[PDB]
Design a binder for this molecule. Structure first.
Ligand SMILES: CC(C)(COP(=O)(O)OP(=O)(O)OC[C@H]1O[C@@H](n2cnc3c(N)ncnc32)[C@H](O)[C@@H]1OP(=O)(O)O)[C@@H](O)C(=O)NCCC(=O)NCCS
Ligand SMILES: Nc1ncnc2c1ncn2[C@@H]1O[C@H](COP(=O)(O)O)[C@@H](O)[C@H]1O
Length: 662
């Protein structure tokens, strides 16, 4: 056995749904691959409600991964009928009406509410009836959500699922321009938002931002209604904007108690989630109903070993896939009791998440390496004042975790009595794909370990594009379908086939990985050109285009660079027009332009002025390798300069970088 292996705790072994040692997991995994249809049919029948089941347990999937045979497609549970809201809520009643669904706390610690499953039912039937009868939302209509992490956010997702509407969630940190682009592309009929929120000391205007987005949408010929939850005096446009309290007042008494369920076919769309690509504008990843429901919920259960006596806390936002699968849908479908937190880990101070852990007796904590590294920098006293005795599983998602952060998470945060589930997956996969399972999986810090049940990863040789056996490094791909796979890109199946199915027979993840002699996977990062910043994808061209809209800017080039907290940061090289007075204020104005066009999440970390221009070939192409190496401080590895039309720029780029140090 490797010396870096960490054994699962004995207590987690005894509690595990799977078993106390690796053989228990491998027995199920083998069955889940060789009897793949029967496995998922048994899971689906065991753990979910179906109005109508699929016709044949031996054939719950049909698919084509080989473009030479025809269009790429995937279907799971075709013929079955179900509803995600019913599985998240109604079926838990009346037996669990008094069970807490969310222990909610606001940014302000004096704002708290324990929301039971019974109360969620009431809230969801009310909102669903508002949507049906006051907004005329019908099956398949698109509804945009621009909401903070408050109970109404989950209510809104589940109410739309209840009636068969398609949600598209826009992260609350996007700007108005980013919000409007998503509403226009999805052709939303309705925007659900809130008056405002707060994050630390920062006010978060939501309806004020939505006002600017809706004005742009109207200029484009759209008519989008807006429903505003009361979270914290807004301007309300007569005829377009309604306070949720006024909408509630229009309900009849029985509309507070009953709302018919729209029974959905298996491949009906559930949500669109706009995701940045290596090239081009963000595209909406499409997830349908039955396969996603099954996959998000089953991975929730096994990857975290969730039992009914556990209390769960995921720190992710609903604006991202982790918040879809592992705050709202997956946890509620398995009747989890969860912490729902509107705020940030450092307000009032850096003990906040630990205050939540101890107050609600959290036993499973799912967070991200950027956040962990921030907690590490703040100092261990903020952690050690908290009682962490209830923690038994800690999870990490979104980006690689290095050994030091992994060890700190387990041995400081979790006091050495936790297993750690480093879950590798992506927006397109619906749920966890490679992950430890508590109690049964020996862990290697920095490795995602073994594939989830029903998942067959492969390592493809980058040059020959065929599978490599045994220990190997190359392109991470998946050789067979799983229930949670995204079904298309909204309005662009051609781009979906091009991006993910360029090698016939495989789903191409866009990640590189190494598989070791124990079959454990080590994800080494994106092999395309998209950035993964604080755990979320952003494309360089989006940031460049935004930077270039500043009137003084001639040209820009954006690269990622290693960042000790965010993993990968945003480094901008740019040129200004002749005669520009370059000042700190001007650089701040260019940064503010990015923040207006995209949002704070896209704030450049470093802005370097290329006094003499960007390195370009004689054909005018920017030589990005040079900028990548400079931004990382790797001056000895710039590589070839002989194709540069302007080789005198290199000396300046290095000297300016050293002055900034970056
Ligand atoms: O968590 P966190 O510490 O707020 O994360 P970051 O500091 O990386 O967030 C970057 C920015 O996104 C903003 N942001 C992050 N999550 C957000 C959310 N859910 N809603 C709105 N804005 C958000 C932060 O307020 C911050 O803004 P600032 O640059 O004006 O200070
Ligand atoms: N556990 C992990 N380890 C390493 N990289 C990860 C992990 N989880 C997510 N990622 C990265 O995040 C990408 C998905 O980003 P996104 O879907 O935009 O949030 C993946 O393709 C990986 O590059």
């Amino acid at each position: 056995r490797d010396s870096n292996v960490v054994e699962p705790t004995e207590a987690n072994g005894k509690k595990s749904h799977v078993g106390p040692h690796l053989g228990s997991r491998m027995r199920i995994y083998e069955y889940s691959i060789e009897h793949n249809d029967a496995f998922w049919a048994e899971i689906a029948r065991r753990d979910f409600y179906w109005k109508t089941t699929w016709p044949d347990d031996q054939h719950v999937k049909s698919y084509n991964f080989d473009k030479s045979k025809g269009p790429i497609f995937v279907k799971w549970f075709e013929g079955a009928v179900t509803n995600v809201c019913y599985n998240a809520l109604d079926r838990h009643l009346p037996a669990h009406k008094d069970r807490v669904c969310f222990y909610f706390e606001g940014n302000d610690p004096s704002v708290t509410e324990a929301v039971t499953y019974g109360s969620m039912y009431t809230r969801v039937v009310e909102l669903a009836n508002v949507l049906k009868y006051q907004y005329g939302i019908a099956k398949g209509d698109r509804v945009g959500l621009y909401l903070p992490m408050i109970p109404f956010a989950a209510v809104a997702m589940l109410a739309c699922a209840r009636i068969g509407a398609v949600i598209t969630v826009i992260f609350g940190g996007f700007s108005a321009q980013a919000l409007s682009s998503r509403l226009k592309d999805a052709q939303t009929k309705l925007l659900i938002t809130a008056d405002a929120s707060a994050r630390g000391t920062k006010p978060i205007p939501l309806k004020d931002v939505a006002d600017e987005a809706l004005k742009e949408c109207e200029e484009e010929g759209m008519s989008i209604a807006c429903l505003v939850a009361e979270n914290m005096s807004c301007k309300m446009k007569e005829g377009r904007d309604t306070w949720y309290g006024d909408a509630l007042a229009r309900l009849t008494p029985e509309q507070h108690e009953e709302c018919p369920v729209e029974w959905m076919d298996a491949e009906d769309v559930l949500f669109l989630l706009y995701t940045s690509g290596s090239t081009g504008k963000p595209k909406a990843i499409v997830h349908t109903t039955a396969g996603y429901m099954v996959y998000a919920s089953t991975t929730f259960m096994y990857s975290f070993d969730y039992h009914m006596d556990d209390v769960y806390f995921c720190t992710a936002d609903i604006g991202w896939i982790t918040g879809h699968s592992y705050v709202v849908y997956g946890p509620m479908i398995h009747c989890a009791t969860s912490v729902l937190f509107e705020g940030v880990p450092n307000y009032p101070d850096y003990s906040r998440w630990w205050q939540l852990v101890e107050k609600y007796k959290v036993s499973i904590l799912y967070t991200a390496p950027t956040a962990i590294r921030s907690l590490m920098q703040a100092g261990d006293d903020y952690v050690k004042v908290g009682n962490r005795s209830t923690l038994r599983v800690l999870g990490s998602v979104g980006e690689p975790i290095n050994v030091e952060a992994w060890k700190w998470l387990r041995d400081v945060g979790g006091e050495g009595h936790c297993d750690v589930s480093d879950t590798w997956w992506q927006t397109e996969t619906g749920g966890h794909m490679i992950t430890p399972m508590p109690g049964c999986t020996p862990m290697k810090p920095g490795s995602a370990t073994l594939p989830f049940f029903g998942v067959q990863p492969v390592i493809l040789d980058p040059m020959k594009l065929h599978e490599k056996q045994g220990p190997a490094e190359g392109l991470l791909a998946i050789r067979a379908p799983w229930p949670g796979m995204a079904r298309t890109i909204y309005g662009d199946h051609a781009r979906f086939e091009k991006t993910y199915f360029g090698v016939d027979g495989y789903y191409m993840t866009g990640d590189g990985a190494r598989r070791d002699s124990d079959g454990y996977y080590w994800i080494t990062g994106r092999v395309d050109d998209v950035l993964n910043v604080s755990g979320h994808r952003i494309g360089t061209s989006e940031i460049e285009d935004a930077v270039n809209t500043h009137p003084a800017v001639v040209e820009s080039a954006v690269v990622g660079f290693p960042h000790n907290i965010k993993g990968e940061g945003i480094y901008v090289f740019l040129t200004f027009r002749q005669g520009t007075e370059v000042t700190p204020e001007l650089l701040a104005a260019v940064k503010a332009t990015v923040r207006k066009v995209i949002g704070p999440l896209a704030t450049p970390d470093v802005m370097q002025v290329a006094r003499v221009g960007l390195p370009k070939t004689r054909s005018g192409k920017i030589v990005r390798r040079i900028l990548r190496k400079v931004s990382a401080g790797q001056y000895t590895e710039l590589g070839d300069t002989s194709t540069l039309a302007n080789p005198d720029v290199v000396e300046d780029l290095i000297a300016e970088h050293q002055r900034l140090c970056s």
